[PDB]
Amino acid sequence: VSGGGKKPFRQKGTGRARAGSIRSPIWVGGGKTFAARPQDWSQKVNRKMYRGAMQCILAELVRQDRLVLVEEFAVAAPKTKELLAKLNDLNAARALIVTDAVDENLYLAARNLPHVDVVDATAIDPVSLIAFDKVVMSVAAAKKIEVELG
Amino acid sequence: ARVKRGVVAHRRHKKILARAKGYYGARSRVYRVAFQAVIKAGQYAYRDRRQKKRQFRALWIARINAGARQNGLSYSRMIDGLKKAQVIIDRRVLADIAMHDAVAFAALAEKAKGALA
RNA sequence: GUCAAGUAAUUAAGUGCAUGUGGUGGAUGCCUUGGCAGUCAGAGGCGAUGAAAGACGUGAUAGCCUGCGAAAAGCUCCGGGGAGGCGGCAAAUAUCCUUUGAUCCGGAGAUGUCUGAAUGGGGGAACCCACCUACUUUAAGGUAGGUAUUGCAACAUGAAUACAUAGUGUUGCAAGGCGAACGAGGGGAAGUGAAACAUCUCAGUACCCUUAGGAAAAGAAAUCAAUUGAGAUUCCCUCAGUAGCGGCGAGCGAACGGGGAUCAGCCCAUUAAGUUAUGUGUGUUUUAGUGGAACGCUCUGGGAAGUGCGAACGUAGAGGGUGAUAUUCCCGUACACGAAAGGGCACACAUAAUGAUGACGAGUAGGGCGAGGCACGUGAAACCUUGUCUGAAUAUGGGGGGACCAUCCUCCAAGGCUAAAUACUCCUGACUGACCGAUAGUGAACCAGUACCGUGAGGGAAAGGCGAAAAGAACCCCUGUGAGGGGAGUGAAAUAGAUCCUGAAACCGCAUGCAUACAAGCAGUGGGAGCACCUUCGUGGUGUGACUGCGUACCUUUUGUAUAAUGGGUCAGCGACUUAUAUUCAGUAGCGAGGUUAACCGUAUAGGGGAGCCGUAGAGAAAUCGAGUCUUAAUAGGGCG
RNA sequence: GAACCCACUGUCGUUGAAAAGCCAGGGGAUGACUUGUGGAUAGGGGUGAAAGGCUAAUCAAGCCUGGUGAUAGCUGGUUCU
RNA sequence: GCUAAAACUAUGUGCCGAAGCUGCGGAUGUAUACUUUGUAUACGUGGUAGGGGAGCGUUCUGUAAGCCGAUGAAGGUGUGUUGAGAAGCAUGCUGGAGGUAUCAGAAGUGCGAAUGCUGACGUGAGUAACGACAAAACGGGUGAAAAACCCGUUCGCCGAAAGACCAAGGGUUCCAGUCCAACGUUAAUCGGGGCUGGGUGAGUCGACCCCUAAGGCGAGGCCGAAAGGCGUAGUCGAUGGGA
RNA sequence: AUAGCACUCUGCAAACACGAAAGUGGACGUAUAGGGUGUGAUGCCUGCCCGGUGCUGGAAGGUUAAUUGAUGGGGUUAGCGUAAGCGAAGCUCUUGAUCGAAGCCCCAGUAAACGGCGGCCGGUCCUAAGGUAGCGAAAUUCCUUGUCGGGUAAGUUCCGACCUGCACGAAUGGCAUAAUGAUGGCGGCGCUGUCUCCAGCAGAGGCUCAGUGAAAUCGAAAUCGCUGUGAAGAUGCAGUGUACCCGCGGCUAGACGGAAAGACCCCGUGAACCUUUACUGCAGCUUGACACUGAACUUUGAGGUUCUAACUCUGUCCCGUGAUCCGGGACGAGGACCGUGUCUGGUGGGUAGUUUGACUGGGGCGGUCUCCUCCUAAAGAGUAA
RNA sequence: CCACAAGUCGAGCAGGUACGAAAGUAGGUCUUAGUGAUCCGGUGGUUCUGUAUGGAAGGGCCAUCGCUCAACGGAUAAAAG
RNA sequence: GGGAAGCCUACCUCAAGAUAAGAUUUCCCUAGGACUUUAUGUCCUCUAAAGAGCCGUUCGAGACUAGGACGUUGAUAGGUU
């Protein structure tokens, strides 16, 4: 805090409580007692623990019937209405779409849809797998995730 | 996450001041004095919940003594006579009867002195 | 009816409690043209062609702020844009400008007083006094240019002193000052710890001085290693709190080897890579901008974006605003276009110049004396620097491998240049936050480094909020043509009426109900009559409390406190066990005789990266052995396993 | 013995008219005198007919800013059930 | 207050008397059996320094483009009600736009004290005091209001300063009109107060200028790790000389 | 402080002081001058001691530094040896003979240098020497209000004198002294409200009314006396006595009243400043060795004589130049000295950083601090002052 | 016996001894006081180590020496008011 | 029975807040309605006594108060003689 170098008044004789600086944390306008600094909040996760958690999440989704397997999922043109109809026929209005590769047309079509996101097979994360109501997965993506074992 | 204390602190102080209603001067206006006053009131209540039983037993014994001496007995002799006669009516009911029904108390005293004889 | 005894009711000068209604005061809640910390990408300077920082002027009205400079809220040209505009506090008003294209936005020019390195001399900064040229005036002046010092170069001139040199002058060129952090170099403490203190530590830290660049420094082995192997410099992870140093105290603390980031070498007189300027060419980026989809009805309401019912766009459901909560009302967003003129960066050519007084390194290596640096404090002390005194050989030669000698291995000093990986943020653009929300966050959200204090260096505040829109209360009344209020009127709301959202507490009034003027103390607590109001009429509710038993505050510190031991006038707001790293133990989860990665790469919480760490075997000072080992002559005994 | 320069006694004043004074008396008053303007000496230093006196109401080592959040085996305080 | 006691000695029969014991209702810790149980039985439940266990509230992040809200959120102020507690819930009035379940996550997470910090307001108390004991009185005027302003008639005080000038220092305080909220230790129509407008005229007065003292700076120069010290020629510097 | 007095240093580029140096003051002075130290007009004067510390002068005897490096002993390898082992030279580790100054030890002088001027019963011991003049119950005398005289009715003060001076004394001056002093003590005249013993009066406050309007303090108060109890001196506890509610003018006995985290005392392994023959450094001063540093003749490694060319001059003249700086040149006087750098011995409260124990019927002074035996010690062990 | 660091008693086993004919006795003295940790150095020995290698210097291990550190569990090599 | 400057009376002053609030003399007030909480009941109209005070002139009484005298039917104060 700016200033505060000098003793405000002498140690004895004035009748006041003794003080050393006008920027003491007791005083209004003084420094904070334990001042914070920038922090790093990342934790370490064991590789095996992460992979096991992903496996458990996928198995729970399967046995809860929130994972929908589809042979092929492609879009003809970058059209939000076309994508919306394609998801509505599958009954997956709120969904995360996982594909072996991310087609630019599909990405552009999905960008503006609320509660719809599209990811590559190698970019799935545990929070995304849980947040969405359904996960629509292609067979090729399922095979790659199989090879990676979650 | 900076936390302000105003709402909770105000609620606590207001509850203490509400419990301090009716006291004299600063005891019902000033938080420090009011807070000291409420604790002392609680301590007094705890002690007096024990003192009350003794005070009421003393009152009953005095009234029974008056009735017995009206009927020609002392309190101790009347109690001993009732114990010997096996009557187990307690002092609260005995004092109530002494206050409100002279004839029944006279009958009880007759029973006690008959057992003493 | 008189008299006499006994015993009720009736007063409030003032006060207490409760409730109602106010005042003062400015907490709380909600909010934000202000802060804090970062990521990505730039940039890393300005100045004698006069800087940073200031003084004074400049307006129809002109005090302050902003802009500008006697051409003075502006002038000229080029480009954009298409209906308002004459900067803000700050309304009104006037004169006005503008589709013959204003205001406004971007680029390039013109002008640019005085002080300040200030540079014609001087000086108490914003002032005083000059000289010389050219033109101009006829009076006592005006215009423009010039007139500092130091260093270098050329020229001229020139003493003691004969040649000369010193000195002196003219011309041309260059430098000085300022500013955040980072770099390099010259000097360099003490508080503190060691539970005292002097060696030591703190620490080459704080501070002072000089001086660069966008980075700097270092750098191509007279280097390490010890299987005869590696191969310039810099930075990160390990090795490792190990080997060592140390009043062997407190403490200080490596290297070798391994894993990464980045990778690059070139010359000493005919002389290289590289770097810096100038011009040209090509490519990219940047300094204004243009277009840019799609909503209706009904209910509540002051107001609809809110309820209910249906519809449309989406490469656009980011954000902001509009009278309450909007993808379809406005500005915008995704996307697609766009530059007269100027700037940056990249690559390639031409010319300069530099590299580049230097051609294999002598007062040098080594030595005696005193110091300093190396993790290393004189130690068994190698190696580096040198204040003083000395002093080689020179490839059949010389340096090193931690005292010293021999053998081996390795390198060639006494001459130079060199990018990247690394360090930082005065500043610019965009974006972000389990950061703050007016006692917080910068000292400063507001005309703040201001008011104020000090001779001076210096120190250093407080102060945000009417309403959607001023629609900011015409007119009447009391009053001093005042202040203040009462009506009327505006507004959804005026107890939103100007220091105006909400309006808590301390503190101070008025009103009603009950108690209170014969009675002694932490002011309550357990009982308890009477009264007033309400009432489901009650074994009910609210207020009060005659009379009565018991009863000497709180905190701290102490053997022990009502203590006449400490602290507190009261209220509201703020105020004290945290953060990073290492280690040990306990829970819990994964894997399990195995477990786990670090730096780093990676459009990146994934996936790679096995160097390293812990566990799996002890004994011994150690060499050495090993389910054993040490001691011993001992296979005895015994200690650790 | 006036001006001027001092400060020996007493009363008052002591939240003063005043952070050193007023009143009544007192000393020197041509000298080692008093005084204006402008200069010099700077902190382990200055100056001192010497009291550790004075050096901006501060002196057995001035003031300001930094080291600095010095250290304190001492005192105080430490917030819901 | 007490004397064949209400004193002392000895004996006896009753009674009073504690938060001790018993009775009735409720809560909780540990252990043993029911071979989950939340159930019975048994033994426990005063506590400073300390150790252990379990919870309540506050701010922010996800869940949350969800749920509540102008038919009224947060905040403020009453009332009723629930739990063993920190606390929870419902609703009248005020207020006028936000709030946030559940389960996880992170903390600027709880104040009565530190002669603690900032602001506001009390008690003393309508108390002390209103700053030289040179001194005032009356008539008229103006004005809402006159002991204090203006005019007039009397009285008193200074007169080597309580009068008249200059330097330093200050900076509009000078003059006129107008106003009285704040300032003036009272009121004020008055003012050194607010507002508006005026006012400073030099060859001879002073400054500037010429000249120098103490002293300062100082081309070259001497000296010093750097910064710098001293100093020659010069150049400044009045408190002095020059119409 | 002072005029006067004394001691001492200083030969001029003075001693001394400031400054890192250049340089500046001393001083534009020259021993009748300048610095330091003590005493303090004047009159009479100023005794004894040189053992100690200091200062001055000698000595070349003993001790001692850097420098120098004679001897002795190890390490290593050519080679000689069956082996053990031996082992030159060369490098290297160590040992340290000889030379070597000042200082110190030693010998004298010095007190207007710092200092000293006794003991124990006439005597004796011991000293370096044992107080001269003058003065003395004093600015010095504990005992002490010593004793005597004067003053007073009565005098712990005053004056005179005496002298068993606890513990005067001659330039840290002795004894006096005219004049002088807002100087200390004592006694008189006049005078008085200083007092016996206070009274009256005048002005300014106090008090009342109108206007403005503070302060320190403060846990909360429905805030009596007495005797007792009690963290040991009670408004608040126990017993008892007294007392209707509330102001105003006075008063200061209590509220251990207000004010300032006691300054006395102790403690902290706190602070600061001052002193010294406390410890350890440094500045300053001083000695020798090496360098700057040369030549020619002599004597018994050292000493001497001479020279000039290094170097010095706060000496003269000339030039830059209009100049008491500075530089160059010419002279003159010195001269291998002086002086400076590195190394080294000595001195060094000038200056700096620090240390200087604890127990303890408070602290200090005294005593104690580790080990063995007995008692206290209560019939096992252990048990404090 | 004991906070630690320390202290005390000890049968018996192996080797080499002395005295006794022998069974045997002897690891100082009737016992309990006669003492000083660590660090740093000195001397003797050693089938330990030895910074490229062979040596060496230095270090280790075993035995032993230098304390009125007496404020005697011993703050420094070195300290009064 | 006697018996002291000592005790209670006696002398002077205060004294019924002596809540136990005492005593004596003298003086004053003798009207109508409405209603319900049917009671020393509350509201209207009429009435206002004996006295006390405010105010004024003042005091040998006085800080302010209190106390004493007087207010035209009058000597209370000033003036006048």
Q: What is the 3-state secondary structure (H, E, C) of B6-66?
A: HHHHHHHHHHHHHHCCCCCHHHHCCHHHHHHHHHHHHHHHHHHHHHHHHHHHHHHHHHHHH
In A1-150, DSSP assigns E strands to 67-70, 95-99, 116-120, 134-138
CB atoms near residue B5 (< 10 Å)? 7
Q: Which nucleotides of E are covered by protein (CB under 7 A)?
A: 14-19, 57-60, 63, 65, 75-79, 86-87, 106-112, 114-118
Which residues contact residue B95 at a Cβ distance below 8 angstroms, ignoring those fewer than 6 apart?
A: B59, B60, B61, B63, B64
Q: Which nucleotide is nearest to A11 (CA to C1')?
A: F261
Chain B 65-94 residues whose Cβ is under 7 Å from strand E: 75-77, 79-80, 83
Tokens linked to B72: 């020609």
- Spacing of A113 CA from C149 C1' in Å: 77
Helix axes B102-116, B91-100, angle to 10 degrees: 130
Q: How many domains does chain A have?
A: 1
**Bridging pattern class, strands A67-70 and A134-138:** parallel
Q: How far is CA A66 from the centre of its chain?
A: 20
Task: Tell me which H or E stretch contains B100.
Answer: helix B91-100
Q: Is the CB of A64 under 7 A from strand C?
A: no
Q: Is the CB of B33 under 7 A from strand F?
A: yes
Which residues contact residue A145 at a Cβ distance below 8 angstroms, ignoring those fewer than 6 apart?
A: A58, A98, A121, A124, A137
- Spacing of A114 CA from E104 C1' in Å: 25
- Could you list the residue range(s) of the whole structural domain that residue A58 is in? 1-150
Phi and psi torsions of A120, nearest 5°? -80, 160
Beta bridge partners of A68: A136
Q: Is A95 helix (H, G, I), strand (E, B) or coil?
A: strand
Q: Is the CB of A4 under 7 A from strand D?
A: yes
- Spacing of A12 CA from D18 C1' in Å: 27
- Going across the sheet that includes A95-99, the strands are A67-70, A134-138, A95-99, A116-120
* Closest to B73 measured CA to CA, from B35, B13, B117: B117
CB atoms near residue A37 (< 10 Å)? 4
Resolution (angstroms) equals: 2.3
Q: ∠B69-B75-B77 over CA atoms, to 5°?
A: 105
- Spacing of B99 CA from F117 C1' in Å: 118
**Bridging pattern class, strands A95-99 and A67-70:** unpaired
Distance CA B52, CA B43 (A): 14
Q: Is the CB of A114 under 7 A from strand E?
A: yes
CB atoms near residue B103 (< 10 Å)? 8
Radius of gyration of chain A (CA): 29
Phi and psi torsions of B24, nearest 5°? -85, 135
Distance CA A139, CA A142 (A): 5
Query: Is the separation of the CB atoms in A53 and A126 below 8 Å?
Result: yes
Tokens linked to A130: 């849980």
Q: Is the CB of B30 under 7 A from strand F?
A: yes
Phi and psi torsions of A149, nearest 5°? 50, 60
Query: Is the separation of the CB atoms in B117 and B88 below 8 Å?
Result: no
Separation in Å, CA B39 to CA B27, B36, B45: 12, 6, 10
